[PDB]
Design a protein around this ligand. Structure first.
Ligand code: CLA
Ligand code: CLA
Ligand code: CLA
Ligand code: CLA
Ligand code: CLA
Ligand code: CLA
Ligand code: CLA
Ligand code: CLA
Ligand SMILES: CCCCCCCCCCCCCCCCCC(=O)OC[C@H](CO[C@@H]1O[C@H](CO)[C@H](O)[C@H](O)[C@H]1O)OC(=O)CCCCCCCCCCCCCCCCC
Ligand SMILES: CC1=C(/C=C/C(C)=C/C=C/C(C)=C/C=C/C=C(C)/C=C/C=C(C)/C=C/C2=C(C)CCCC2(C)C)C(C)(C)CCC1
Ligand code: SF4
Ligand code: SF4
Lengths: 141, 80, 144, 733, 68, 68, 152
């Protein structure tokens, strides 16, 4: 799938709180989650309190990926809404984060490369004495 | 970043992929099981170490293993 | 911005509070740090002189106040040390200032030079000089 | 690689504060530093050994110098029984006038501390009588420390750097350590005792400037070479001898009298010299067993391999053990720690029943302090032995090379060992607690005659077998006519029986029903601690709850909430849990010893004989009764010299309680609190100009457990030391 | 919830009835009434099986029992 | 400061003689004049009608340690 | 006699302790009226104390120096009743209990869900099993000889 863009999406109606962004967002990174709602309704923010999502496209800024994924999974489970989130850097780079292939990870998709596979039982790992004085680890072999 | 490894005893029940809170694991086609699929952990750098994938795994011993390793801002769960 | 971790309250955002805090020597961006540090040290030493002479171990004898004054001066020295190292581990020789660049309205403004090696060094020197001067003035006014 | 932990990049990359906390914690784990080899590890160990030797020598030199400069050794040597030794002076700007006037003790002109270490008697016994001797000793020890540092620096250099093949030469090292380290040192000590200490005991002075013109024996070296050794045991010191004077002395230098010197209540110096001579001869003879470059001797590998019983009841026997021991250093550390702990416990048990220093038996506080110190040290060492054994199992064990040898069979049947240890512990604890509760209830209801009191007949019989006539049996040495008695009567029993049959000394004190329960409690504590440590060591590589424990390492927090929850699953947690039991057992032993000895010294032994059979007697007649003088160190009216101890008492309590904070409350609460505090610091004006460089985070799990254990141990030790010293020194009896 | 409340009320009433019965039968209330200052209240009497009879103290008024 | 006894003359003698105002300002005073001084009765109650209390004073202690 | 112990009838501290106990009881006895029930209870207590001391003197125990009886667990034939016989009785009772429990467990192991039988005991089967423990040593010895005691 080709990554999308989020040029000028508006934001939900919130009154403000103390659970928002901090110095890390200005210094290190933050995250942006965008979705589409068919009607105006009230949802619960991960940072505390309740907000109202405008009908149409909605955009939100958060601090960590866990909050974004929790909000997205709540939206999918309760409202049946498609969502996607990116990560934003101080220099202006925007990196597409949620589904990279265009399909959800729980669904098998052809053309996916396998990482971290060991073709043996968990009890076939070598003893730590065999890998001593080397930079490798037993489970890495 | 912690280390997540997958062994060949997996039966492709997709519980670990659903349990992950940071979208680390996904599913790929495979050949040596009835379900014809197997899990993988590409986005290793986003792991926090909650070990929910190990909590949801039916096997004699877990086919997904998490080993704690060098910590950073992402793995420490810091928002400030 | 409702999504920033801060709230707007009458105490945190009032014309009187804003004016009073912006007129404090620690927030004057245009002024070079030495003149601000001198005032800060003067005020801090003048305040610090009192409790040592009023609750010191020798507070009942005739030496009391004099001894207390000395103690106050010693504290200032320690505080000056606690400043100097804080500069050395924070600001490098060639890096620019790290202060915010734009104001609340959005206008671009020159960043403060206090968050710089030379600026912090000037601030610490002025603080030391002002603290010593304030301690001496307080002692002279109290026991002459 | 660029931050403070230069030996670990992984710990140097993270931005939190734990990078500091762990940086101190892993500085001595040479096997964890990246890019490590065997050569570097061995050389670093060698340099650390040299540094430790230098530190020990510097500490001893400092003690000697302070005793010489601010002590009263010259005043103490004249009247040992009526002078309090002085350790060092006190300078304190916080002292008030009453404290200055109350802390002046002895002949000093200012505040001083009384030395309970017991070095005054040790230095007086060996022949030191002046401050110049102490100054010379301090100078020599400083020179030795400098030499040790120089040697360490020299052997850290490339040209003089040894190789790994040098560090693995077991036979040569064993020969050299058995011959020169243990035998030659004992021979030199015997020479010192004959040449300097004994003449000093008889009123003569022998020093560096006149030791070549004085003959230790009038006969000379003739009898030794010719053969008539008995000439060296002709004229022993008389029973009217006064230490340090020429009244009623003798000329013999090696005897086997036995017993104690009457005036000093200590062992004879000639006996000590004779013992050292015999020990040195035995070690010199026995240090020739193993093979070296001369083509004669034994090979340890063949000795181990040749010991396999026919019939296969022991598996393959001892095959492959030589390589396992030689390649792994944790095995060697565990063996050395076990041996050192046993030796320390033996020293603690021996130095109080057979004192070797003059006028130390009449100094009660020194005896109690030394016993408690050595027993606690031995307990800690014994715990460390099992800890390093578990580390060895985790790291340096190879299942393939150790196939079906004794180690494999040990790992084969851990379940039986654990089950039997658990059975023994349960049995002992159940029955000891039941008997104690029954006796307590019987005393509470007012009918003491219904108590269950059982005599320790076995120990009494053993005591009677040594020549004690307080029970009635006549066995072996007690009977007048017997092979043992007739064989030994001519030489050592005439003094041994006299020493053992006196009631003043602590040699084989009388025992009754009150010691039975305490001994069984000690056995229960030993069994439970051994069970904990053995389970931790054996279950290190894996179990049913986690069959891949060896992959994670020696120390790791947990394995998550899955499978019902797995907390404290590692072996580090097993050592952590056994530390508490070690402390409790040592506390019980010290309580028993202190109460028995304080009742013996106070002149009444019926109090312990009667009140030690129930726990209310322990609570009322030992702690509450003896704390009255300690808690009165400072009162609203005034204070005395005990005040400091009282302060320390309270201090210890506080630390103990603080440990509980780290031992119950866990991490998430504090992490949320830290997040809230960080927000509060960021939002405030005039304080957001100052910003941190490392992000503050709460402590880890293992780190918090370690901190809690350290607080617990510090509070325990400080509180007991303060109570013991204050109670024993308030009465001086 | 309603049924649990009713059961709790029944238990409380049983406890009160037991306290009143103990006050009525095994007590020195009548002796304490005349001289309240010099007599200690007592409403429990211990059996004489094992040797626990020492728990029957001299509360006063010609009675032996546990002071309440 | 409150409880005590009165003689016929009119003087009042308190149980602990009014030592609260000078001994309760330090932790050592709390440990010595309250915990140590007032625990004499509980540990010396063996063989009397209060002995049961003393037994409890031990038993609870055990339970506390067990909790650890 | 043994380990410097005195027979309890000869010792004087035993009689002294009896005198102290009797005096302590009579001190409280003197308060109440002769016809009052507390006087009868205290007289019964005094009689019980005297009988207990007489029995302790008769049984031949050895009081120590403090005047309290001591127990000998050596195995001396003169003191077998203090430890050895109660030990044999306790061993018999414990073997009975253990054999009954193991027999019930083996009996209920056959069914499909023994857990429901453990949480809800069945009374007829347990009643049948219980009385077989009267002959537990013989059955245990025979099972050990056959080889049915230890699982394989
Ligand atoms: C005969 C010559 C010789 C001698 C004297 C030594 C001696 C020593 N070697 Mg060895 N060594 C030798 C040959 C020799 N070596 C050879 C040929 C090799 C090559 C194979 C080695 C290989 C070697 C290595 C690789 C190392 C040593 C180390 C050491 C030191 C051990 C630490 C210590 O001080 O123990 C002190 C020991 C004792 C005091 C002896 C008695 C101990 C018992 C337990 C005490 C008895 C108690 C008694 C009552 C004392 C009372 C005290 C008093 C206050 C009352 C010590 C200096 C180690 C070291 O520390 O290096 C600096 C080290 O790492 N050695
Ligand atoms: C451990 C080292 C040691 C050392 C260095 C010394 C040193 C000394 N001794 Mg002492 N001595 C020692 C242990 C030691 N002793 C012991 C253990 C005893 C008890 C038996 C004695 C008892 C003793 C006596 C009875 C005498 C000395 C004397 C002497 C001096 C003369 C030595 C000599 O000429 O004959 C050495 C002769 C040999 C042939 C060397 C043999 C060596 C091989 C390896 C054996 C010398 C200063 C003599 C003296 O006059 O002192 C001033 C003397 O009369 N010593
Ligand atoms: C004979 C010497 C000896 C030696 C050379 C070693 C060697 C080793 N030990 Mg072993 N050990 C020993 C004895 C010894 N041990 C004993 C006696 C015990 C029982 C207590 C242990 C128990 C033990 C454990 C539990 C562990 C080791 C481990 C290790 C290794 C890591 C070292 C380290 O990280 O420390 C550096 C540590 C510190 C500098 C920080 C802790 C310092 C403590 C908390 C100080 C106490 C505070 C102080 C007293 C407060 C004073 C306050 C004042 C009021 C009094 C190292 C190879 C570790 C391992 O993993 O090995 C692979 C490990 O986990 N050891
Ligand atoms: C003083 C309190 C205390 C006590 C009594 C115990 C007791 C015990 N510990 Mg624990 N422990 C404690 C504190 C304590 N611990 C602490 C502070 C720690 C540090 C974390 C540990 C850590 C620890 C470890 C690591 C281990 C133990 C083990 C044991 C057992 C040892 C075997 C034995 O002695 O059985 C004697 C049995 C008893 C004294 C238990 C009490 C019996 C009661 C009084 C009888 C019940 C009768 C009565 C009718 C009650 C009815 C209740 C009512 C509601 C009806 C035993 C259960 C060991 C083990 O489990 O061995 C199998 C073991 O491995 N303990
Ligand atoms: C753990 C071990 C333990 C042991 C070995 C004992 C031992 C004893 N207790 Mg003590 N006791 C204990 C713990 C223990 N107690 C505890 C924890 C408490 C606190 C609850 C007490 C409180 C206590 C009291 C209050 C009394 C005793 C008494 C006694 C004696 C019992 C006399 C009797 O019943 O036999 C006669 C009866 C039998 C032999 C019963 C067995 C018959 C079976 C059912 C067979 C039937 C068929 C064949 C005995 C010497 C009694 C005493 O008088 O001692 C002098 C007594 O009054 N105990
Ligand atoms: C269960 C383990 C056990 C353990 C670890 C200890 C431990 C100890 N005992 Mg104790 N003891 C035990 C059980 C135990 N005892 C029993 C069952 C009795 C009989 C009442 C005694 C009676 C006893 C005496 C009289 C003395 C000690 C003393 C000691 C110490 C020295 C060792 C000794 O003398 O060997 C004695 C070792 C044993 C007898 C081994 C017993 C092991 C078996 C398996 C116990 C169960 C057997 C069973 C009940 C017997 C048959 C029943 C019978 C009626 C037919 C040591 C602290 C001595 C001491 O130093 O006191 C200061 C001492 O004087 N013990
Ligand atoms: C609040 C709850 C309560 C409690 C804790 C008690 C407690 C007690 N009752 Mg009381 N009692 C109560 C309510 C209560 N009662 C009520 C409601 C009644 C009216 C029926 C009585 C009538 C009563 C009588 C008639 C007697 C007691 C006696 C006793 C004591 C012994 C009980 C016994 O051993 O039974 C044995 C256990 C079973 C049968 C099973 C015990 C102190 C006895 C007493 O104190 O004798 C000296 C006794 O004689 N109680
Ligand atoms: C059914 C009978 C039963 C039997 C035959 C055994 C047998 C045994 N136990 Mg086990 N055990 C039982 C129940 C039983 N246990 C229960 C209920 C518990 C939980 C409290 C335990 C917990 C346990 C521990 C912690 C240990 C043993 C150990 C042992 C062994 C040594 C004996 C001993 O130390 O006793 C110890 C006895 C106890 C701690 C209590 C058991 C007694 C209970 C109260 C009665 C069981 C009766 C049962 C309710 C009868 C129902 C049948 C009826 C319906 C017809 C031995 C194999 C020890 C070992 O491992 O040795 C190798 C040991 O460490 N057992
Ligand atoms: C691998 C390493 C190998 C190392 C090998 C080392 C070998 C060392 C050998 C030492 C031998 C010492 C002999 C001492 C001795 O006999 O008297 C050594 C003694 C020592 O002499 C003493 O010296 C003292 C000095 O302060 C005092 O003067 C004493 O009074 C005096 O007795 O000489 C005597 O005259 C004593 C009386 C002996 C009895 C009369 C003579 C009997 C016959 C002696 C025969 C000697 C020669 C045979 C042995 C030769 C060995 C090579
Ligand atoms: C974990 C581990 C470990 C460790 C271990 C340990 C730590 C142990 C200990 C142990 C011990 C700690 C032991 C002890 C022992 C002892 C003994 C064995 C003793 C004996 C004795 C005797 C025999 C005596 C005798 C006698 C008598 C009685 C008297 C006189 C005479 C005579 C001498 C004869 C190791 C490293 C190996 C490795 C593996 C694992
Ligand atoms: S430990 Fe947690 S974050 Fe890491 S892969 Fe498993 S479920 Fe995902
Ligand atoms: S939970 Fe375990 S078995 Fe199921 S898909 Fe994941 S790794 Fe495979």
């Amino acid at each position: 799938t080709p990554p999308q863009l989020d040029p000028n999406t508006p934001s939900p109606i919130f009154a403000g709180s103390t659970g928002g962004l901090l110095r890390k967002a200005q210094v290190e990174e933050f995250y942006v989650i965008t979705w589409n709602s068919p009607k105006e309704q009230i949802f619960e923010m991960p940072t505390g309190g309740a907000a109202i999502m405008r009908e149409g496209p909605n955009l939100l800024k958060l601090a960590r990926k866990e909050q974004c994924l929790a909000l997205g999974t709540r939206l999918r489970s309760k409202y049946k809404i498609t969502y996607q989130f990116y990560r934003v850097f101080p220099n202006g780079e925007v990196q597409y984060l949620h589904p990279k292939d265009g399909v959800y990870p729980e669904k098998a998709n052809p053309g996916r490369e396998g990482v971290g596979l060991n073709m043996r039982s968990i009890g076939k790992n070598v003893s730590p004495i065999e890998v001593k004085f080397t930079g490798k680890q037993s489970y890495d072999l | 970043s912690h280390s997540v490894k997958i062994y060949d005893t997996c039966i492709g029940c997709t519980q670990c992929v659903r349990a992950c809170p940071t979208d680390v694991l996904e599913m790929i086609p495979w050949d040596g099981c009835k379900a014809k699929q197997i899990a993988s952990a590409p986005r290793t750098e986003d792991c926090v170490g909650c070990k929910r994938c190990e909590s949801a795994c039916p096997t004699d011993f877990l086919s997904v293993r998490v080993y704690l390793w060098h910590e950073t801002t992402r793995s420490m769960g810091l928002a400030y | 911005d409702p999504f920033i971790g801060s709230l707007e309250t009458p105490v945190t955002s009032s014309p009187l509070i804003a004016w009073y805090l912006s007129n404090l020597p620690g927030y004057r961006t245009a002024v070079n740090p030495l003149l601000r540090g001198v005032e800060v040290g003067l005020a801090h030493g003048f305040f610090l002189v009192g409790p040592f002479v009023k609750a010191g171990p020798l507070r009942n004898t005739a030496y009391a106040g004099s001894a207390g004054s000395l103690a106050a001066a010693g504290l200032v020295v320690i505080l000056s040390m606690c400043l100097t190292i804080y500069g050395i581990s924070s600001f490098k020789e060639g890096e620019p200032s790290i202060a915010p660049s734009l104001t609340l309205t959005g206008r671009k403004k020159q960043p403060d030079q206090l968050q710089t090696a030379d600026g912090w060094a000037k601030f610490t020197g002025g603080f030391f000089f002002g603290g010593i001067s304030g301690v001496t003035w307080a002692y002279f006014l109290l026991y002459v | 690689a660029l931050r403070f932990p230069r030996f670990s990049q992984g710990l140097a990359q993270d931005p939190t504060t734990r990078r500091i906390w762990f940086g101190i914690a892993t500085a001595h784990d040479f096997e964890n530093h990246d890019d490590i080899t065997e050569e570097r590890l061995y050389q670093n160990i060698f340099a650390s050994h040299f540094g430790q030797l230098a530190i020990i020598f510097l500490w001893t030199s400092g003690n000697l110098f302070h005793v010489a400069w601010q002590g009263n050794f010259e005043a103490w040597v004249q009247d040992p029984l009526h002078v309090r030794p002085i350790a060092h002076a006190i300078w304190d700007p916080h002292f008030g006038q009453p404290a200055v006037e109350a802390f002046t003790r002895g002949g000093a002109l200012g505040p001083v501390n009384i030395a309970y270490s017991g070095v005054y008697q040790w230095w007086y016994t060996i022949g030191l009588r002046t401050n110049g001797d102490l100054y010379t000793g301090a100078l020599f020890l400083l020179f030795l420390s400098a030499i040790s540092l120089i040697a360490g620096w020299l052997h850290l250099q490339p040209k003089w750097k040894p190789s790994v093949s040098w560090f693995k030469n077991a036979e040569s090292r064993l020969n050299h350590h058995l011959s020169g380290l243990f035998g030659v040192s004992s021979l030199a000590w015997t020479g010192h005792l004959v040449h300097v200490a004994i003449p000093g005991s008889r009123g003569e002075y022998v020093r560096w400037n006149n030791f070549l013109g004085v003959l230790p024996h009038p006969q000379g070296l003739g009898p030794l070479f010719t053969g008539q050794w008995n000439l060296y045991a002709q004229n022993p010191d008389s029973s009217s001898h006064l230490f340090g004077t020429s009244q009623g002395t003798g000329t013999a230098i090696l005897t086997l009298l036995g017993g104690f010197h009457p005036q000093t209540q200590s062992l004879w110096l000639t006996d000590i010299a004779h013992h050292h001579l015999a020990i040195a001869i035995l070690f010199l003879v026995a240090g020739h067993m193993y093979r070296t470059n001369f083509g004669i001797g034994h090979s340890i590998k063949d000795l181990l391999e040749a010991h396999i019983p026919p019939g296969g009841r022991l598996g393959r026997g001892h095959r492959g053990l030589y390589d396992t021991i030689n390649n792994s250093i944790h095995f060697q550390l565990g063996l050395a720690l076990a041996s050192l702990g046993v030796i320390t416990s033996l020293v603690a048990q021996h130095m109080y029943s057979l004192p070797a220093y003059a006028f130390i038996a009449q100094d009660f506080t020194t005896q109690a302090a030394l016993y408690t110190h050595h027993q606690y040290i031995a307990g800690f060492i014994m715990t460390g032995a099992f800890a390093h054994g578990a580390i060895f199992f985790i790291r340096d064990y190879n299942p393939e090379q150790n196939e079906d040898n004794v180690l494999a069979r040990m790992l084969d049947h851990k379940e039986a060992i654990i089950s039997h240890l658990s059975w023994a512990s349960l049995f002992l604890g159940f029955h000891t607690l039941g008997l104690y509760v029954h006796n307590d209830v019987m005393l509470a209801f007012g009918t003491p005659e219904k108590q269950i009191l059982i005599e320790p007949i076995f120990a009494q019989w053993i005591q009677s077998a040594h020549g004690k006539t307080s029970y009635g049996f006549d066995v072996l040495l007690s009977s007048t006519n017997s092979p043992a008695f007739n064989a030994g009567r001519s030489i050592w029993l005439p003094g041994w029986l006299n020493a053992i049959n006196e009631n003043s000394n602590s040699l084989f004190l009388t025992i009754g029903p009150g010691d039975f329960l305490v001994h069984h409690a000690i056995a229960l504590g030993l069994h439970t601690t051994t069970l904990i440590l053995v389970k931790g060591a054996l279950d290190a590589r894996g179990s049913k709850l986690m069959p891949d424990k060896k992959d994670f390492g020696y120390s790791f927090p947990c394995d998550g909430p899955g499978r019902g929850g797995t907390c404290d699953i590692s072996a580090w947690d097993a050592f952590y849990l056994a530390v508490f039991w070690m402390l409790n057992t040592i506390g019980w032993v010290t309580f028993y010893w202190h109460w028995k000895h304080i009742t013996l010294w106070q002149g009444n032994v019926s109090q312990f004989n009667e009140s030690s059979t129930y726990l209310m007697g322990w609570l009322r007649d030992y702690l509450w009764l003896n704390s009255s003088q300690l808690i009165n160190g400072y009162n609203p009216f005034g204070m005395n010299s005990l005040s400091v101890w009282a302060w320390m008492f309270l201090f210890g309590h506080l630390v103990w309680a603080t440990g509980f904070m780290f031992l119950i409350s866990w991490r998430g609460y504090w992490q949320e609190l830290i997040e809230t505090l960080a927000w509060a610091h960021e939002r405030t004006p005039l304080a957001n100009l100052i910003r941190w460089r490392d992000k503050p985070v709460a402590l880890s799990i293992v780190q918090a457990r370690l901190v809690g254990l350290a607080h617990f141990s510090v509070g325990y030790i400080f509180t007991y030391a303060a109570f013991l010293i204050a109670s024993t020194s308030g009465k001086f009896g | 919830v309603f049924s649990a409340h009713f059961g709790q009320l029944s238990i409380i009433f049983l406890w009160l009835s037991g306290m009143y019965f103990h006050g009525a039968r095994f007590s020195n209330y009548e002796a304490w009434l005349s001289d309240p200052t010099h007599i200690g209240p007592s409403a429990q009497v211990v059996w004489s099986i094992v040797g626990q009879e020492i728990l029957n103290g001299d509360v006063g008024g010609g009675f032996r029992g546990i002071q309440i | 400061d409150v409880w005590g006894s009165i003689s016929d003359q009119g003087v009042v003698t308190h149980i602990t003689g009014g030592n609260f105002a000078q001994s309760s300002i330090t932790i050592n005073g709390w440990l010595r004049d309250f915990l140590w001084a007032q625990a004499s009765q509980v540990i010396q109650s063996y063989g009397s009608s209060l002995s049961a209390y003393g037994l409890f004073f031990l038993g609870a202690h055990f339970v506390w340690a067990f909790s650890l | 006699d043994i380990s410097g112990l005195t027979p309890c009838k000869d010792s004087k501290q035993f009689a002294k302790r009896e005198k102290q106990q009797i005096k302590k009881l009579e001190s409280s006895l003197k308060l109440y009226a002769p016809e009052s029930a507390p006087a009868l209870a205290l007289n019964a207590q005094i009689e019980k104390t005297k009988r207990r001391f007489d029995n302790y003197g008769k049984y031949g125990l050895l009081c120590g120096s403090d005047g309290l009886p001591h127990l000998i667990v050596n195995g001396d034939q003169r003191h077998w009743g203090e430890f050895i016989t109660p030990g044999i009785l306790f061993l018999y009772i414990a073997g009975w209990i253990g054999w009954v429990g193991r027999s019930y467990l083996i009996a209920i192991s056959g069914e499909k869900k023994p857990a429901m039988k453990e949480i809800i005991i069945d009374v007829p089967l347990a009643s049948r099993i219980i009385f077989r423990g009267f002959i537990w040593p013989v059955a245990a010895y025979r099972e050990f000889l056959n080889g049915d005691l230890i699982a394989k």
